[PDB]
Amino acid sequence: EETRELQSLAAAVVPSAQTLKITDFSFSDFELSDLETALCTIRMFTDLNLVQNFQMKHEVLCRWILSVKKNYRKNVAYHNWRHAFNTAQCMFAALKAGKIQNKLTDLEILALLIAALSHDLDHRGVNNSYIQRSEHPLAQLYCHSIMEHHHFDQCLMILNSPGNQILSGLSIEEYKTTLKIIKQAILATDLALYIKRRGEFFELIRKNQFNLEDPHQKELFLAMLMTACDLSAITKPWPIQQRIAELVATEFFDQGDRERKELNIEPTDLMNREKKNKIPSMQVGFIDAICLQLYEALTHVSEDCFPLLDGCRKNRQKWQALAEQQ
Ligand SMILES: CCCc1nn(C)c2c(=O)[nH]c(-c3cc(S(=O)(=O)N4CCN(C)CC4)ccc3OCC)nc12
Ligand SMILES: [Mg+2]
Ligand SMILES: [Zn+2]
Numbered sequence: 572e573e574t575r576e577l578q579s580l581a582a583a584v585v586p587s588a589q590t591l592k593i594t595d596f597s598f599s600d601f602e603l604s605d606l607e608t609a610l611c612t613i614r615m616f617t618d619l620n621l622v623q624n625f626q627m628k629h630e631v632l633c634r635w636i637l638s639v640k641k642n643y644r645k646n647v648a649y650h651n652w653r654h655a656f657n658t659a660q661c662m663f664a665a666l667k668a669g670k671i672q673n674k675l676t677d678l679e680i681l682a683l684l685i686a687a688l689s690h691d692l693d694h695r696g697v698n699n700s701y702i703q704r705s706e707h708p709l710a711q712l713y714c715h716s717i718m719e720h721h722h723f724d725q726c727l728m729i730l731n732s733p734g735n736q737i738l739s740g741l742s743i744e745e746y747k748t749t750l751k752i753i754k755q756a757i758l759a760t761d762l763a764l765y766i767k768r769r770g771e772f773f774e775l776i777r778k779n780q781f782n783l784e785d786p787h788q789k790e791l792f793l794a795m796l797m798t799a800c801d802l803s804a805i806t807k808p809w810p811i812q813q814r815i816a817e818l819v820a821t822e823f824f825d826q827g828d829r830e831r832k833e834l835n836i837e838p839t840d841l842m843n844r845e846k847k848n849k850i851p852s853m854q855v856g857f858i859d860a861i862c863l864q865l866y867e868a869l870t871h872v873s874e875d876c877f878p879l880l881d882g883c884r885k886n887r888q889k890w891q892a893l894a895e896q897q
Contacts, residue, residue, distance in 0.1 A: 759794030
């Protein structure tokens with residue numbers, strides 16, 4: 572009974588952020604039950620003062636959180652509720668412990684937490700291995716971020732659902748602003764857009780021109796932050812990263828088997844279940860080509876975000892050792 576779950580959530584006591592450990596970049600959700608992750612999400616809206624500043628009703632927030640959780644497919648190995656929850660938790664830790672909070676407006680923080688929780692809504696486990704698709708000479712020919720547009724539509728749908736309207740207390744303007752920020756934040760999770768815009772972001776930082784008052788730079792930064800949180804599984808303590816890496820591998824292999832039957836093509840190592848031995852080398856490659864630069868750049872933005880980078884490096888060292896097969 573969906574109602575039974577709601578009644579349980581809305582009536583439970585929400586433990587403190589400290590007890591929940593949602594402030595740690597090292598936070599893990601493995602020992603938490605769905606109910607507990609929901610309680611964590613409430614603590615996130617509360618401690619970021621979103622419930623207060625936007626007068627959200629307890630029951631309505633609980634319902635919205637349960638609706639979001641419900642619209643994720645538990646059958647998809649990695650891109651499910653737990654990934655979205657972790658993304659939001661990383662966003663919370665970055666805002667608080669990473670001190671990104673005071674560099675943003677209350678609306679932007681509102682949009683970011685909502686986006687982090689809704690960016691992979693109704694994901695089917697389809698991943699695009701062609702990571703350079705945004706830089707191809709004809710990139711403008713194949714519509715980009717199709718699924719991300721779907722995730723947002725889903726996000727918007729749930730926000731406008733009777734009893735789930737956590738943004739009802741906003742003005743007509745505040746609402747419009749918040750929805751635009753959310754849409755961009757969600758679209759930013761298309762890794763291709765990260766590849767396309769990171770160069771610009773890195774340079775602004777390298778040359779000391781970074782300026783969050785410039786709306787264009789604020790938007791670029793929000794996109795980079797979304798990516799940072801989205802990939803943060805790669806920064807977790809070794810044992811946790813290993814398990815998360817398995818889930819990612821499993822969703823890849825599932826696609827490989829699915830495409831073999833539907834497209835009559837054999838999978839590349841990335842999506843070949845018989846190639847688990849090549850995972851560590853690929854992780855090192857993923858880290859070097861995609862992660863390190865992002866977390867390093869974020870550390871320049873705020874030194875307190877350093878632990879994400881640090882955790883990432885430690886994992887590189889772990890995966891590398893395995894790559895060399897001890
Ligand atoms: C879409 C999944 C993004 C992602 N998140 N996380 C935490 C990981 C990860 O740990 N590894 C990989 C990953 C990336 C590449 S990649 O850098 O070569 N590249 C191709 C595949 N796309 C989807 C990502 C980029 C190759 C293998 C990977 O997982 C190995 C188990 N992707 C993600
Ligand atoms: Mg996505
Ligand atoms: Zn994601």
